[PDB]
Amino acid sequence: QNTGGNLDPAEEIDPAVSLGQVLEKALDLISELTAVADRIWDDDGGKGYSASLEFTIPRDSTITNQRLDKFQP
Amino acid sequence: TYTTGSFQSLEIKPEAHVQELEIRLDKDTRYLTQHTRNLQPGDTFHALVRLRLTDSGGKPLAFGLIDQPGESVELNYTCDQDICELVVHVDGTDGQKDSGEAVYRLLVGINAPNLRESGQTPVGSSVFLESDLVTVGLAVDQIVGVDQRSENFSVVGTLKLSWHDPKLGFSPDQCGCTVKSFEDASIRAVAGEINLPLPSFSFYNQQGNRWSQNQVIFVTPDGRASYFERFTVTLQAPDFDFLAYPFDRQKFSIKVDLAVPTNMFIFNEIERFQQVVGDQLGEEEW
Amino acid sequence: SVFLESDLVTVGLAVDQIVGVDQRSENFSVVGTLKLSWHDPKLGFSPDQCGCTVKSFEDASIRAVAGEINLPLPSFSFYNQQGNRWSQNQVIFVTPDGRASYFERFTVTLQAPDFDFLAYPFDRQKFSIKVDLAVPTNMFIFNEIERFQQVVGDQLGEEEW
Numbered sequence: 001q002n003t004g005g006n007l008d009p010a011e012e013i014d015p016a017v018s019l020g021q022v023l024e025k026a027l028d029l030i031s032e033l034t035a036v037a038d039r040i041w042d043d044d045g046g047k048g049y050s051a052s053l054e055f056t057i058p059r060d061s062t063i064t065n066q067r068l069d070k071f072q073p
Numbered sequence: 074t075y076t077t078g079s080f081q082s083l084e085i086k087p088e089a090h091v092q093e094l095e096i097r098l099d100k101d102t103r104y105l106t107q108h109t110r111n112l113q114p115g116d117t118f119h120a121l122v123r124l125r126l127t128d129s130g131g132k133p134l135a136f137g138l139i140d141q142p143g144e145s146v147e148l149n150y151t152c153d154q155d156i157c158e159l160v161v162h163v164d165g166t167d168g169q170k171d172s173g174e175a176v177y178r179l180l181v182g183i184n185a186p187n188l189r190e191s192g193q194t195p196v197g198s199s200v201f202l203e204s205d206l207v208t209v210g211l212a213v214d215q216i217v218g219v220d221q222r223s224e225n226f227s228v229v230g231t232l233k234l235s236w237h238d239p240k241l242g243f244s245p246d247q248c249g250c251t252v253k254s255f256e257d258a259s260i261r262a263v264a265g266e267i268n269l270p271l272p273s274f275s276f277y278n279q280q281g282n283r284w285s286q287n288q289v290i291f292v293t294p295d296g297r298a299s300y301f302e303r304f305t306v307t308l309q310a311p312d313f314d315f316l317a318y319p320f321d322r323q324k325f326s327i328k329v330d331l332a333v334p335t336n337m338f339i340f341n342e343i344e345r346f347q348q349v350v351g352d353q354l355g356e357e358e359w
Numbered sequence: 360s361v362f363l364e365s366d367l368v369t370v371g372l373a374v375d376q377i378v379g380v381d382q383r384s385e386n387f388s389v390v391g392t393l394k395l396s397w398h399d400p401k402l403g404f405s406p407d408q409c410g411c412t413v414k415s416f417e418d419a420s421i422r423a424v425a426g427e428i429n430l431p432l433p434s435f436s437f438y439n440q441q442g443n444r445w446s447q448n449q450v451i452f453v454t455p456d457g458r459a460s461y462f463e464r465f466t467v468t469l470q471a472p473d474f475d476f477l478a479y480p481f482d483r484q485k486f487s488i489k490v491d492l493a494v495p496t497n498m499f500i501f502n503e504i505e506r507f508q509q510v511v512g513d514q515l516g517e518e519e520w
């Protein structure tokens with residue numbers, strides 16, 4: 001869900017280094033981001049049809065070139 | 074006439090929507106962007122001839138896989154999102170170069186270009202969401218004034234825009250009258266009234282507010298709307314050069330710009346609905 | 360930085376003509392183009408909610424847009440105009456990243472007290488077009504001048520000035 005701004009919606013961490021590493025590469029990109037996120041969940045792309053998540057607990061934002069002029073993540 | 078619109082899943086192979094075109098690259102338009110219409114849940118977009126495919130919001134959706142046979146890059150994507158819009162963007166300038174000319178052709182299909190296998194493809198339907206086609210006609214009745222110290226000229230004339238917008242269509246019975254007319258309100262004001270896109274225009278040089286008379290924008294149920302306005306407008310004329318007065322020849326340039334980009338509306342055809350310059354009694358100054 | 364620094368608004372101005380100079384009243388009517396450009400993250404939005412990428416408010420002043428959407432904007436003024444200027448093609452459009460820009464082709468009659476015609480016709484005059492911001496330096500400041508277009512236009516003819 002999105003309220004204000006251009007925000008695009010076990011063990012948890014915040015590996016922001018992968019962001020810079022991907023930005024360093026020549027931006028397939030979605031597939032690599034999905035693989036990195038799986039190694040480290042779902043994303044939203046529209047209002048009213050946000051992608052749902054399936055979870056199973058048996059034991060106890062994203063990156064986009066939202067501008068259409070020049071493709072820059 | 075056969076009616077189309079909105080009211081209150083078989084044999085999809087024959088209704089293949091696949092069409093192609095050739096493009097020219099030069100000057101600033103090195104980067105090219107194209108849209109597409111809403112698609113069925115099962116439709117898969119195949120792009121053939123870098124290039125990338127995103128949605129209307131710019132969120133990346135697919136890239137192109139480079140297959141050496143056939144040159145260029147081959148791109149393919151599929152989704153089941155129902156009401157959504159997709160965009161394909163191609164960049165031809167990955168590095169600084171002299172360039173100056175580029176010829177390029179593309180292959181585009183919304184379900185299956187493989188079935189059509191390119192070719193002439195007569196039954197293909199264009200899916201680029203092409204810009205609406207608005208014809209424009211202008212006539213000059215008088216040049217009422219020329220203020221040559223301020224370098225402006227006040228001119229009276231008639232203007233007539235005419236464009237086909239199927240989304241603007243309606244059922245004639247709901248209001249009784251066949252033609253739905255919005256009187257004495259500018260195209261921008263009408264677009265404010267009804268939340269729809271319209272080809273708002275401007276004179277690009279007028280100083281002060283022009284006098285709009287008899288202006289009316291009326292729509293036909295088929296969707297072919299037309300706007301008419303008898304204006305008395307004071308244009309600015311920088312091109313005036315009175316260094317050779319009185320033996321000078323001047324250019325009265327009346328420029329009707331569209332307040333919407335070429336993606337939305339473009340002036341297709343000039344309409345000679347009336348004599349471009351009117352003949353009136355008297356010698357007249359100009 | 361946690362000082363809530365003032366937003367950076369770049370400004371560009373070009374003069375197409377000096378249409379009039381009323382030297383008894385000491386004013387000059389000038390036509391030109393003005394372009395403000397500022398980044399406001401609070402002004403960002405999701406592109407999908409409205410379809411179009413850029414959200415544009417047409418033929419309405421920056422102050423009028425700030426009235427429409429309850430957000431701060433760098434409203435400006437000419438500080439010397441007498442009467443109402445003719446604003447043409449004025450549009451303020453916002454990019455989802457948040458970088459908004461305002462464009463306006465004005466025909467405005469500025470007042471020029473600095474006129475001193477004691478040496479007419481051998482006089483040199485200063486046409487000073489001063490775009491003030493209607494918000495304090497805490498909120499917005501003119502950071503960089505933008506040379507988007509030739510500052511003074513070259514037009515056919517000798518021209519008076």
Ligand SMILES: [Ca+2]
Nearest residue numbers: 311514515516
């Ligand atoms: Ca001139």
Ligand SMILES: [Ca+2]
Nearest residue numbers: 353354355357
């Ligand atoms: Ca006459």
